[PDB]
Amino acid sequence: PSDATPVLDVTGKELDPRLSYRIISTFWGALGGDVYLGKSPNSDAPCANGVFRYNSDVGPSGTPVRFIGSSSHFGQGIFEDELLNIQFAISTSKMCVSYTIWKVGDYDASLGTMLLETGGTIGQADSSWFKIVKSSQFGYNLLYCPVDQFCLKVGVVHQNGKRRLALVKDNPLDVSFKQVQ
Numbered sequence: 001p002s003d004a005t006p007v008l009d010v011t012g013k014e015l016d017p018r019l020s021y022r023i024i025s026t027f028w029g030a031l032g033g034d035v036y037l038g039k040s041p042n043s044d045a046p047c048a049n050g051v052f053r054y055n056s057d058v059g060p061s062g063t064p065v066r067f068i069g070s071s072s073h074f075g076q077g078i079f080e081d082e083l084l085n086i087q088f089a090i091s092t093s094k095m096c097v098s099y100t101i102w103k104v105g106d107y108d109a110s111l112g113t114m115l116l117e118t119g120g121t122i123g124q125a126d127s128s129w130f131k132i133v134k135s136s137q138f139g140y141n142l143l144y145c146p147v148d149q150f151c152l153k154v155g156v157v158h159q160n161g162k163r164r165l166a167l168v169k170d171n172p173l174d175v176s177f178k179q180v181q
Contacts, residue, residue, distance in 0.1 A: 034062025
């Protein structure tokens, strides 16, 4: 437990839960690529249920997200180290609304870890809770907090030639947040 430290966007402005953000690299070239919503390979989901990032920044911009803090504090803005749900902030059909909400998938034996998916819930005991922390390198990392040494880093594994976000032990994905519009 610490003093509220707001998360900032790429402009230095505090993140607001009332706004949407792309989760971007802040490297450019083949190192860049924003996070986006995509189809998981040979998935039985009726809607896109994969959390990926593009393979470079010469390509489209990512899928905007919003951050939804728990019933605790919340605190006006979005603060480091506070539990939240993550949701892609897009229009879908009624049946796909759940498949905007981030969750952690089951263990995937092809990749030796749990992949990030959508199809989750918000604000509930079965929801996937994440938190944003300052990277030891640059920008921020997203951590998954089931139920620093405790929550599990979100990183990338390579899946069929794509960057798929997943739980990692080392080399977390370093990100920045860029407000939509």
